[model samples]
Target: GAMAPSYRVKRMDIAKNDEECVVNAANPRGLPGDGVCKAVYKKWPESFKNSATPVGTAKTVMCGTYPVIHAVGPNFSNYTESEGDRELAAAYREVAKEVTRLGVNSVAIPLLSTGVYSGGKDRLTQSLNHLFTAMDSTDADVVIYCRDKEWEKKISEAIQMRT
Candidate 1:
């Protein structure tokens, strides 16, 4: 038997929840980045511990206080917008695997693409669908945090379909 997560999905502000560290979807570099960073970056300072710079793309860097899920999106790519959703989904998968490896089974992730650099809902959600689908077998409790009620409704619907 697996954790199965009890098949429950919830949304919240992951920025403040270090118990279940938030996923960053970063540039394989460091923290306080993208839309997710906008909210938590101030909470987690740059000069703080586990702070660094971007080295590559699609690389998951979890060496942060809350342990950021730094996976470089396609927007951070040299081609730009090319397969960014694929990168985002990959980030989510890596985040799940990393947290599980750390023995932290519960994780709250911001949509990972709700920022200026993101490709918006359609693009982001498409990847989230796949991400959530792939996470069905993960031995963890994953919560998809949303700041907007409207989007939360949308995300809930998506989760319903994916899980």
Candidate 2:
């Protein structure tokens, strides 16, 4: 009836899920210092090799059965929040492209530019919108993990815009 591998934007606390991977934006060093990274590192000590600390644009890490994507965002690009959205989108774009490699139907990711990307309300919306635009061509059931009702509502709208 519809295209296979259908996707939808939804709300949920990523850390609570173990079956699904919660891709957290990481810098080249895989620094799980603050924001989502901090929570992920503190709880999952082996999350980043406990310090693989390799510098790169993007990379993938194994969280036991799940794979947490580490795509270094525009943390140091000196771009404004809006510009950084595109940069973050470029990095996160890899996640959708690698769905088949990860061998999963589900992928949950936060707005890549959030937290220390110097975000505001618009940052989340823009991030979701940009990501949905990129994932429109992907084969995974992409989930834009939202932290609150507002984030949920915004992502839902973004998904609608794509369809």
Largest TM-score belongs to which candidate? 2
- Using lDDT as the measure, which candidate wins? 2
lDDT of 1 by residue, 40-130 (tens): 5665554234544332232333445445555444553233554555555665666556666656667666555545545443554765675
Residue range 1-163, candidate 2, lDDT tens digits: 1237665655666666533566766766666667767766766657687334232235667767667776666753367655566676777567665554676767777777666664333567666666767667766666666667876776677667757
List the candidate 2 regions with Cα displacement exceeding 4 Å.
Answer: 1-3, 50-56, 80-86, 119-121, 161-163
What pairs collide in candidate 2?
Answer: none
**Estimated TM-score per prediction?**
0.70, 0.77
Of candidate 1, the 10-residue stretch with the lowest lDDT total is: 52-61
- Measured over all alpha carbons after superposition, the RMSD of each candidate to the real structure, in angstroms, is 3.9, 3.4
TM-score of candidate 1 to 2 decimals: 0.70
Candidate 2 lowest-lDDT run of ten: 50-59
Instruction: Candidate 1: list runs displaced more than 4 Å.
Output: 1-12, 27-31, 46-66, 76-82
